[PDB]
Structure formats: C-alpha cells, structure tokens
Design a protein around this ligand. Structure first.
Ligand SMILES: Cc1cccnc1-n1nc(-c2ccccc2)nc1-c1c[nH]c(=O)c(Cl)c1
Length: 127
C-alpha cells in the first residue's frame, strides 16, 4: 500500500501574493488552530499506510491538512484568502466523508471547524 505524493506547497508556475487577509490566516487563524488540543490528527497528510487505512485514498481524492496549509501560507503559495479557506474546508470535508458521523475524529474536526469559522468571521477587509 502506498501513499500518494503530498499536495504541493510551492509551484514556480503559480502566481504568489501576500495580502493582509492571508497574513491574518497565518498569524491568527492557523496559529490558533495549530496549537489546539485536537489539531494533531490534522497537522500532516494522512499517512494511510502507517495508520492502516488502506482505503483512505480510494475515497479521498482531494487530500488536505494543516501542515500543507501552514507551508503554503509560509511560502506565499496562495494568491488570495479564498484559496486558503478552501483548503481548510477541504480538510474538514475529507474527515467527515471518510469517517463515520459521531466518531471521535469527527468530533475533533467539528470542534476545530467551529473555531475556524469563529476566527474567519473576523477576517479583515482587504487593504
Ligand atoms: C485519530 C486516529 C484514529 C484512528 C486511526 N488513526 C488516527 N490518526 N492518527 C493520526 C496521527 C498519529 C500520530 C501523529 C499524527 C497523527 N492521524 C490520524 C487520522 C485518522 N483519520 C483522519 O481522518 C485524520 Cl484527518 C487523521
């Protein structure tokens, strides 16, 4: 069983930009979520081999995690805030799709998502 290559975190062909909103996503949003008690399952790509979930990448064709998000923000990979928001929403959705409602990981994701939403409710207007 093999993992797919992880999502890219830089690309010379993709335009890059810093915006005040992306900075807020790194400094406030990601910072807050990263150190939460439930962040650890989401801090890196799902290692389907070592975790023994060999159907994970049969079901999840759009893998995303906060390690990837963090590196993309750090690298200025994103053009806008909406690209970054999308990656968080992809991560959460992947968890809900693969796992069964109720399950512990799902409750962890929900708590993380609640906090995410609270933080992006205060995204600044772009300068
Ligand atoms: C929470 C869980 C339950 C059952 C199987 N694997 C997991 N793990 N374990 C980890 C882990 C372990 C050590 C260091 C970093 C992450 N990550 C998961 C995991 C399982 N299923 C998922 O949908 C995600 Cl997003 C993470």
């Amino acid at each position: 069983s093999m993992n797919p290559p992880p999502p890219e975190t830089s690309n010379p062909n993709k335009p890059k930009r810093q915006t005040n909103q992306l900075q807020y996503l790194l400094r406030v949003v990601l910072k807050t979520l990263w150190k939460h008690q439930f962040a650890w399952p989401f801090q890196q790509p799902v290692d389907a081999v070592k975790l023994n979930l060999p159907d994970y990448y049969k079901i999840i064709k759009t893998p995303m995690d906060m390690g990837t998000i963090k590196k993309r923000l750090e690298n200025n990979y994103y053009w806008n805030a909406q690209e970054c928001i999308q990656d968080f929403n992809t991560m959460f959705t992947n968890c809900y799709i693969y796992n069964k409602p109720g399950d512990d990981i799902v409750l962890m994701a929900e708590a993380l998502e609640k906090l995410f939403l609270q933080k992006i409710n205060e995204l600044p207007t772009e300068e």
